[PDB]
Amino acid sequence: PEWYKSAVFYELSVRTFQDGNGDGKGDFPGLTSRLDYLKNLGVDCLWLLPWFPSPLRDDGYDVADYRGIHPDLGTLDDFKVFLREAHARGLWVIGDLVTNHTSSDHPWFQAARRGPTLPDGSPNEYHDYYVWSDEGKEYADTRIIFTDTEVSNWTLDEQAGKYYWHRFFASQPDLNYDNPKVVEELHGAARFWLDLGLDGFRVDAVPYLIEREGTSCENLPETHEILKGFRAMVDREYPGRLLLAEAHQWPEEVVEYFGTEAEPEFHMCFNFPVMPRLYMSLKREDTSSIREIMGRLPKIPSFGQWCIFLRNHDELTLEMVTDDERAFMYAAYAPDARMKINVGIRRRLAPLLDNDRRRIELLNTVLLALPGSPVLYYGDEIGMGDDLGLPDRNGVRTPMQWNAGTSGGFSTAQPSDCFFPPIQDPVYGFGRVNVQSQLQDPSSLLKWTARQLELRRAHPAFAHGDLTFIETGNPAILAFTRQYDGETLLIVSNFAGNAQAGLLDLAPFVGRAPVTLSGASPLPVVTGNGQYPVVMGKYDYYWLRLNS
Amino acid sequence: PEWYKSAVFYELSVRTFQDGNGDGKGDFPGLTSRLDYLKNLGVDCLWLLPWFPSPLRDDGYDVADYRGIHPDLGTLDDFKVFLREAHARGLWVIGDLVTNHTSSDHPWFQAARRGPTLPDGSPNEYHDYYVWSDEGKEYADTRIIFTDTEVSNWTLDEQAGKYYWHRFFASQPDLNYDNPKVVEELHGAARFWLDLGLDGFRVDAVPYLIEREGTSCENLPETHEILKGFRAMVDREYPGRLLLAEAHQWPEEVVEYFGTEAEPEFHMCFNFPVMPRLYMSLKREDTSSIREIMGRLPKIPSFGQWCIFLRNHDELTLEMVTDDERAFMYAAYAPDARMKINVGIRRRLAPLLDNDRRRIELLNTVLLALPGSPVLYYGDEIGMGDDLGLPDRNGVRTPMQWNAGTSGGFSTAQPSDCFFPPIQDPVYGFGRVNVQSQLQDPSSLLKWTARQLELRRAHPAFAHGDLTFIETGNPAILAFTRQYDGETLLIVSNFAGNAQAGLLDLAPFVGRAPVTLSGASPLPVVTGNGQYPVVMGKYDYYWLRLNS
C-alpha cells in the first residue's frame, strides 16, 4: 500500500536524455518535453542522476552546490516546471543525494583547505567538514574502490599542508560525519529539495560515511546510525517521501540498511547481490547461483522493498562475488581488455547478451518476476548498445536515441558536438535502434517491454507477493512461486540456450489448474505426487497462475 | 541422389537485386558481385525471374525475345560471366521459361496480327502462332486469373480485327500449343539457354497451355503431353537439368505435373497447397488444416521433389482455398482493402507476421522441416517490408537492402531514381533493415537463417525423409517425424501466441531419448505407453532427433 512498492523506476541522466537548447547537452526542458514517453512506457517514478553544480570530474557526483541546478541543465525554475509536469502525469520523481562526498570545487572544501585557524585568528568552521590526517597513515585495511585511477585513499593538499580522505576520486573529498554540523548540512540539503516537492532520494555510497581504525570502513554501526537519523527526519518532516539506498555489499550486510521496525532506515535497497548471478547463470546455464544468493537475504521490515535491476549508469560490478566468480565473469562477458574497469565490466545490457532478444526478454521477465520494484536503465528498453571508446564508465551513458534523424533525436548539434557522442555503428546506432521505429514496430522490444509491464501491473503478487523456489531438477530451469492476496503466481524460466526438460515439485499444489497469464491457456491440472513435467524452448519463460 | 533434392533455392529478380553502374536498375554485373553472399547465406540454386527483352508490362513475364538479355540487365556476355562465376562457387542457376504467352510486342504476334493471309495473298505462317477467335465466344466456362483488371479472356485486336486469347493481361497473348511450330519454337528456346549451361527452368503457369471447348481449360491432358515432351527433350539431350513448375492448383491436380515414372513431366512442383494453411493455422492457433492438406497430396515419383515456400514475387494466393478459409485469411492478413489483389494478399512475409521474429522464425523452421527443397524469397532473410505505393504486386519486389548507404546500397542512383524506390519507412527501410547491419549483428535474422540452413544440412533426413504426423492432442502444437537413413527426426512446433501443453504419441519410440539438434541436449527417455507430455512457449519450435 506504500506507493514505491508497486512502483516501477526508470533511471536517466538529464545531460544524456534530451537536449532542448541545441547546446549538445541535455536539460530539464528537454526532459520535460518527453514525460509523455515515460508515463506511456509504464514508468511510475523517475530516478534522475545528480543535477547539481559540478565540474563533472565524475559526471556530477562531485557536487559543488547542493541547492543549485547545474547550468548545462537549465534553471531551478526549469526544474520546478518539470516537477509540476511529471506530478500532473502521476509520476513520482526521486533525485540523487551524494552524502559521502562533495567536489573539491565545493565552497566548503575550498574553505577547508585554509587550515583550522584563520588568518585573523578565529576558527575556520569548514575545516572539519572534511577528514584530515597529518601523514596519511590512518585507515590501512581499506580497499580502494576506483582501482584504475587511485593508488591511495589519502591525498596531499598543497594549501592545507595535511592529507584528506576520499573513498572515490581525489577530486571527491570525503565528508566527515563525526562533525555534527555536516549531518545538519545534508539534512538541510534534503529539506530544500523535499520542500520543492521531490518525492525522495536515492542515496549514494551510503556504506562509506564513517571510517574507523581497524575496520574496512564499510557498513560501520555509527554509519547506519547517521542513516536512521535521515529516515527519522524524513518520517517526521515529510511523511510519504522515499529514501532508496545503493548499498553494494554482500546479502548479509545489505539487509541492514533497512534495519528494524523500531529503528527504521532505508525504505528500499538495491538488490545488487542477485544481479551478477543473473548474468552468471546464463553462461553456466545453471541458475543455482540465483537461489543460493536469494537465500542469503533475510526478511526485510514491513515497509521494506527491494529495487531489482539489470544494468545502470555504473559498470557491471564484480566487487561482491568470489574470486573465481569474478574470473569467470570477465572470461565470459569481457573478452576484451577495454571492456573492464575497476572490478567490473563497462558494457550495456544488449552487448552483454549478444543482442539476443530471447535473452534480453528472459532477464527482463526475471527482473519483473523477482520480488521488489524494478528499475530500468534508460535506452535499454529499446536495446541500446555502448561506446567503449569513451573513458571511464561513460560508454553506457551515451545519449537517448529517439529517432533516426540528426544525433538520434537527442540534439540538433552534430554527433561530435554532443556531450557524449550518440552511437551510430551499424548494430546499435540510432538509425537502426530508436524510439520512433519502435513505436511503429508492432513487435519492437519497446512494445514488448511496455506489454510486459502492463502484464506485471495486472497482478499485484509481483510487487507484494512472497517468493518460494521449487525444485525442477534441471538447474537450467528456474521456477518459483509468488503468492499474495488471492492469486498464486508460478514463474518458470529456462536459462539455457536449447530445449530443456524439467520435473517441477508442485506437491503443495495438487489439483490446481495452472494457466497462462497471457490469455489463460490451460496446462494440465496438478495430480498425484505433484511432480509436474515441463519442456522449455531456448531461453523461454512461463508466467502462470494457479487456480483453485 | 539428384542435386535439386538437397538444394536450397533463392528466388531473386536481377532488376532489383544489385546495380553495378548507378543507372538505377540492377544488372548481371551487380548480381555477380553478390554471389559470395548467397553462397554464405546457405543457398545452392539461384532462380532468376525473367531476364529477357520486354515492355515489362508484367515485370518481364511478357517476353519480346526468348534468346536475349534485357538491356536493363546487361549483355549476353554479362550473363555468361555470371554463370561462370556462379558455377565456380558450386551454385546452380535456373531461369524462368515463359511458355504460355509472349508480349504483344513480340515479333511473332506483331507478325500474327497481320492476319491469316497477307495483302499479297501469300499465307501468314505466323498468324496461328496465337489463338484466334472470330467473335470471342469459345471457352466461355473458364475463369479470369487477373480478376482485378481483365474483364474477359478474349480481347479485340484492332489490326487483325478479331479476338485473341489470353489467360493473363491483354498484353500477353496466349501461345497456340495446337500448332506444332510453337512447341518447336519453345523447345528451341529452351535449348538456347540449356546450350549456354543454364541448369534448368522454372516453367511459368503450366496449367494453361492447352484450351479445350466445354472444359475449364486448365490441367487438360493435352498440356501434360506438351509438358511430357519438354521433359523428354531435357532428359535425352541435357541430362541432369531441373524442370520446376508453377502449378497453382488443388492437390489431386498438382501431383499430375510430375506425371509417372513411365513417362515423366516435372522434376519439381511448388507446394502451393500447404502455404495458405501455414498462415491460416497461425491465426487460428490450430494446425489441423496443414495435416489435412498434406494427406491430400499423393506420393510423387522417385525423381520428384516438392518445393516448399512462404512468399514469392507474386501475391500470397488464395484461389485454392474454400471461401470461408478465404474470408478468414482476408480478415486476418488484409485489414486494408488495398492489401488484396487477384484473390490474394500482396504483402511481404515480415509485414504479414507483424515483424514478429518468433513468428518469422516459426514459419521458416516449418519451411525447412517440411519435405522438399525450400525456396527463400530475396530479402526475406533480413525481414524486408512492402511498398503498396507501387502498383500490382511490385510492392514486394522493392530493391535489395544491403547497407544503409544512399539507396540502401542497391544503387548509387538516389532513391527517387531507381526502378522501384528502395523502402525507407521507419520499421523496414534500409536505415534499419539491411545485410551489413545483420552481418555484424550476432543475433540478426540473417544469422539465425544461415545457422538454421546450416542445421538442416547436418540432417539429410530433412531433404530426403518421409513425413508422419504425431497426435499431440492440441491443435496448436504440431508434431511429426522425418526418417531417412539411420535416423528419425522429431519436429514439434507451437502455432499459438502463448504457452501450450501437449501429449505426443511416441509409442513407436519407447525407451529412446529425444536429443536436441542444436546442442545435443538429451531429454527424458520415453517410458510407458510412450505418451510424451510437453509444454511449449509462444511460437516455439523444437527440432529433435530420436536415437538408436
Ligand SMILES: [Ca+2]
Ligand atoms: Ca566518508
Ligand SMILES: [Ca+2]
Ligand atoms: Ca495457352
Ligand SMILES: [Mg+2]
Ligand atoms: Mg541544453
Ligand SMILES: [Mg+2]
Ligand atoms: Mg544497372
